[PDB]
Subunit: 393 residues, 4 copies
Amino acid sequence: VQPTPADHFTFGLWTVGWTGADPFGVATRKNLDPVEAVHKLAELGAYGITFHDNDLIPFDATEAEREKILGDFNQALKDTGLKVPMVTTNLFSHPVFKDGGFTSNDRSIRRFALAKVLHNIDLAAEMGAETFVMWGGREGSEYDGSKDLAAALDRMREGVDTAAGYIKDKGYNLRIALEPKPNEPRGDIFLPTVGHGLAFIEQLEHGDIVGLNPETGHEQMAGLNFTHGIAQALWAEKLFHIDLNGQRGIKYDQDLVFGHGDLTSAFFTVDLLENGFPNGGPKYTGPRHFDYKPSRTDGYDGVWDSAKANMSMYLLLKERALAFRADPEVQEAMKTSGVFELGETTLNAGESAADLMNDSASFAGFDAEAAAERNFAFIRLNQLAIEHLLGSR
Amino acid sequence: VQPTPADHFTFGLWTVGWTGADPFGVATRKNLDPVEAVHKLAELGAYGITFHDNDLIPFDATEAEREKILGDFNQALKDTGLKVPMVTTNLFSHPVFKDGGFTSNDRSIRRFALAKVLHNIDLAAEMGAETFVMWGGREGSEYDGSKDLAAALDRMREGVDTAAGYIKDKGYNLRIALEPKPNEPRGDIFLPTVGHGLAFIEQLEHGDIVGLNPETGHEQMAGLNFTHGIAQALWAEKLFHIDLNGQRGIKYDQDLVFGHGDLTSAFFTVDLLENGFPNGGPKYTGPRHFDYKPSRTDGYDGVWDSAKANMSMYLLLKERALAFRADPEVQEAMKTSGVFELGETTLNAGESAADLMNDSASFAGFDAEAAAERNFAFIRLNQLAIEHLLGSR
Amino acid sequence: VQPTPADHFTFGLWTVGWTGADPFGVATRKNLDPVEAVHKLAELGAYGITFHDNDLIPFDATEAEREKILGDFNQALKDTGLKVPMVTTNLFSHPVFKDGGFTSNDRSIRRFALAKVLHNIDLAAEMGAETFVMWGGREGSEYDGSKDLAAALDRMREGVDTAAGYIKDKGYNLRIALEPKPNEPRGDIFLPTVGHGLAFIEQLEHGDIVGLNPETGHEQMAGLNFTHGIAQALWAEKLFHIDLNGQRGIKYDQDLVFGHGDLTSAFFTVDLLENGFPNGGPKYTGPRHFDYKPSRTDGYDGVWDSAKANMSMYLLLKERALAFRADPEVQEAMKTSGVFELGETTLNAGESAADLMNDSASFAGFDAEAAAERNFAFIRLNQLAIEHLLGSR
Amino acid sequence: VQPTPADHFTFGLWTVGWTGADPFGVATRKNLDPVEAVHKLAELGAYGITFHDNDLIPFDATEAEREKILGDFNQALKDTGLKVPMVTTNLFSHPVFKDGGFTSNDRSIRRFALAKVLHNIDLAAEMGAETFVMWGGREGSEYDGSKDLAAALDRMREGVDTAAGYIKDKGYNLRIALEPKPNEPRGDIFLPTVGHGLAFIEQLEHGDIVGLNPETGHEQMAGLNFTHGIAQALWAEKLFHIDLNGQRGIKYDQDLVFGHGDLTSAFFTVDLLENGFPNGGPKYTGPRHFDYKPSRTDGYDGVWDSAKANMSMYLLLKERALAFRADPEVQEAMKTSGVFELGETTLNAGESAADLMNDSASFAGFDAEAAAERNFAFIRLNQLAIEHLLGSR
Ligand SMILES: OC[C@H]1S[C@H](O)[C@H](O)[C@@H](O)[C@@H]1O
Ligand SMILES: OC[C@H]1S[C@H](O)[C@H](O)[C@@H](O)[C@@H]1O
Ligand SMILES: OC[C@H]1S[C@H](O)[C@H](O)[C@@H](O)[C@@H]1O
Ligand SMILES: OC[C@H]1S[C@H](O)[C@H](O)[C@@H](O)[C@@H]1O
Ligand SMILES: [Mn+2]
Ligand SMILES: [Mn+2]
Ligand SMILES: [Mn+2]
Ligand SMILES: [Mn+2]
Ligand SMILES: [Mn+2]
Ligand SMILES: [Mn+2]
Ligand SMILES: [Mn+2]
Ligand SMILES: [Mn+2]
């Protein structure tokens, strides 16, 4: 332990503010005031806080109410020093968004949702946020005949490109990040994985300022490898923000503390974020944001314990991942396994497709049966990682 | 029933040729000769046959052996009239490909794999194939430390762009299709879903001739909605080929007959392929290829029954999907649910982002509580589809 | 297809009464007066209604209020003729039940939970129910060290045996039905599948009146085969009740209309309920109960439409499943496949183990390679089922 | 951490002997002489070895060959000191077993399968095994109409009761352990989870000597909690053997090294095996058996390295899990959380149902809102476990 603001640990107001209402029961904790959240998070070592528009401003609030609320919010920020690196919009709670915001079958709900996003971009800019996150939780269906699937993507593009053009038009220093989720609350959510979100961005007019906001638990709900998924976002220059938490299996979104889900996977996620790639390449330098929910069985001391635990987990794994990579036994194990060898291009500088085909050395006279004998020693290399993770080495 | 060549039903040689060896047991049927496969498939109504290089030419074969084999193959094609619309390479059976072809940690295996693909492009062109499919089944890992994840994607890009540049250089009338699979045989396979494959293509130098080959069962192994997934491929102008089969759940790749997995989902897949989108848009016009495996408990009469059953299933659902959409009760149900309304743009012709924000009608004075009362009637609309599917209407 | 009370369709009050609140948003529908639920279900063809103590009687109800409400609900039943075949207790909604009722860590809470069940058994007895369902939704944990697992099963045993002991003591004509669910709301729920439910029942002092209430979607939440799980329950004579609905994959509990999830699986469930086993055996004769939730996107015509969709789906599957088994072609296929040879004992009349090992024909000179030649033809048999399901036969 | 025979590590011959053939490719390693397996495992610290009849003795072995092979294998055991605690039968590899052994549709095949098991029980008895495992891998179906499900369970019962009856008849000191697997190679396997395994055992004439052999990966294949499933088996006193390995999600059976799958889950499995239940109860004392497969990418140093990784992982988890429970801080946390109050009966000494309902303190005047205020602090307790696991405490 000991997180400091330099670690860039950010928390959403809704994480610690999560009161416990689930599908089978009512809240188990008292509402948390947002000024209280800020003082408490700053006491713990956080660098910043994120929020959804309705986390701070009730759906109902009048302009006078809005201003009362923002002034205390801003004072708190001032008194503590926390930044506001990311802002997001609630397009899922109110009954109006029951069929989605941007891809609602109703045109007038679509306009209302886009209106709400546009206004929220103005608050984002005013707050000093660098990222605007979009989670399309109600965009999807339970039944396959509910939507025209091409029209749904057209409507998604229209929303995102209007938002994007508005940033560009106003000159805000903001990027858009899409947050994928496979299901829940909808049976099928559109752009369900990091893959679908990356692909979708390439069809946009204003894709240059649109990237992703992957969430550990969300890719694990489709049973995918989260390190692989973030690696491809990174590789594409699209890992703009990240949500860290835990998920044990393919079930409802659990949003456990980071490291309380798939531990081995969390260790390799930390190694990619902190250390980057073994042969060198891109590095993710944004905030380490925790999108989790404090277990409903626990009271407020559990809330603050859980906020701490997210930061401890990440620093404990960071430590073990630094020792792991620095270990000369591991570096040699890596070399034997061909980790560095993957880094060499397949073709020689200047060789063409017809030049290699025609190279007798790599095809006609290649000894495939000899080449197959190679002991990659991937088990041994996995054993060294686990032993570094167990604090054994 | 009655399929004819005009239906464009294509089968891989390995489907009907699947002898039954699984991870827990030996083959239960005798090898099937490829000339026999062609006569039998042509008798049934198929339009074409696809194959992997090693399905026809043993890994070991000499040029004299290659030519003996191709001449009988080509004669059979000639005598029956079946086309060869797609060809693919085996980069997974031989022990040399145990760490992958293109993303093998060993550089010399990478060159061998690319050599093998290049040579197979020449046979593809000679056969009259329009599509060259790439399934990267051994590209991936069991453990997260096994690979440098950026280097793996670099190596994947280098392979695919060399292949692509070679087509372009030679002027073959061929496109590349990537076939996604989440896992098996590898713990984690790279580009595991339609999403990841679409995204990956956008990072290529020669992406203009690279598209996808989605497989029903493969997206269902990540628990995804296959109709949604193909809809996004289509929408992107990237649905170049398709593999149809069945899968009951998230488990090993089952490759059941099409319609013997998720039936409701198969019905909507057929509706998108045959009918396209309710508001109009792109249409998939390629071959309807069945990538399935005849159950190992069944003998050869089951093989030919199973080939028939794939075509019957697709024609039975086609029929029900045509009746469903033609039904005036359904068209009215669709209209009530806003299916057509999704097709209208959100913004009015000429309206800007600042023009709608500022439109009092869609934000400040919008009645969200009134708008939330809308009965979308999605259940009723799903009930009409199921009733058309049950042959009830 | 029109349901009559003869059909035995029963609906939970909480099903049509579902308000639409989920984890990400508020209710989309006004609360349903129970009196109105009764009258409405009676006009649709329902046979009876089921409820949870708190669905009718609020947690904090005074005795004058409790009397009133019961007066109103008995009146409605008397007017309409609806029966009340099953009653159940809410041990999940109040914040007190955050760690469970029966298996809470706090002893005072376990006593309050058992007391709440005992009172509810009186009520069940007063309404004329035959079945008392226990759904242990809060029984389990998010974390592995949270519970003493042997002690959680003793605590579950204590509560269920006390309830069972009380039933017998009072002379009520009531059986207890346990209802498995693998996860949600807890990360792991105890007795997660039909198998675990059955196994626990065998360790009970009063297991003779304790059986199962399997739910379609719940077994599909662990990827199991619903038809196989209720077949084990039938076979053990412990299928006391059933909850019919749809689930589209391993994800949050969807509670879709019966037949709106896995369609083929629904078809074979209905065949099992209607036709029983091919070679004879126990048959289920209780209520066909629907535990579903009207999608929150739908408004009140949608609620009664969804109610009605359940009974339509069941009657359509039933029509097809009777047709399927009555078909000569199907019977012939069944014969070929060995469905009726499975029913023949393996041993001969008074043949012992020793007798069989010594029989040379069965082992020593058994021709294993000739016996492996059988064409089981299970694919053709599956094709016949689907053709009956699709009403093409 | 160095294993000694005192540790009781047992390995299947088929584990280190796995050749690397999977569904998509051929073997990557030469066959392993069993004599050599024995000697090698003996030098690593193995306590004993287990095998399948056909792992040692080929299907078609003549009697002179069978004698030889057994002579060779008994010699190796005598030289090394290795015990043979469990023996099992291959009822899945020959094409004859394509529809199962015990539950095949063909009666001649069921008789041959039972005969094959009876002979194998003699052999088990001759090798000194305490346990006889039955893995019904081919028992199940791909399609729902393939089997008469009540008849499949009677057929399973018949075979298992005959085997059990024969054991008792011969006076062998042998218990039968059933091993669940939910799917693969069949689409649905009968008795798919620990729960179903336990439930079936209660319908057996000779259930007293019939218990379970749960496998880590198999329960994780249905998304269940391995620790909860073996806790139910322990509690019912039916945990006769166990198979330890790793699984990374709901997918094909991976058989990774123990600890190379779900790490936290492994940690809590080891705590259950070593520490038993927090409030006391049955303890498992059999062999710690590893049913894994050396990844096919690895060559022979990798095979012995993987063997050794199993025992290292187990010893490292064991060191941490003993430390964890010995920690005062952990004990305090456990107290707070109610882990020890779960062990207190709910009822008082001679308190009846009637007594509790009438007790006003437990119901009528129970303060539910005050009792809901308890901070169970399960998150802090989970954090302590992980900190012990990571060796940071
Ligand atoms: O704004 C992004 C938030 S929205 C919503 O609270 C959700 O459940 C989260 O997973 C996303 O991170
Ligand atoms: O070439 C594409 C083939 S390769 C391999 O036979 C595989 O299992 C399939 O799913 C793919 O469709
Ligand atoms: O007690 C029966 C009910 S309790 C609760 O409403 C639950 O979610 C259901 O699945 C059960 O069937
Ligand atoms: O009989 C024990 C073996 S049989 C077979 O090898 C299987 O795949 C395993 O999981 C079991 O543990
Ligand atoms: Mn989440
Ligand atoms: Mn998130
Ligand atoms: Mn497949
Ligand atoms: Mn395929
Ligand atoms: Mn449910
Ligand atoms: Mn239910
Ligand atoms: Mn296994
Ligand atoms: Mn096993």
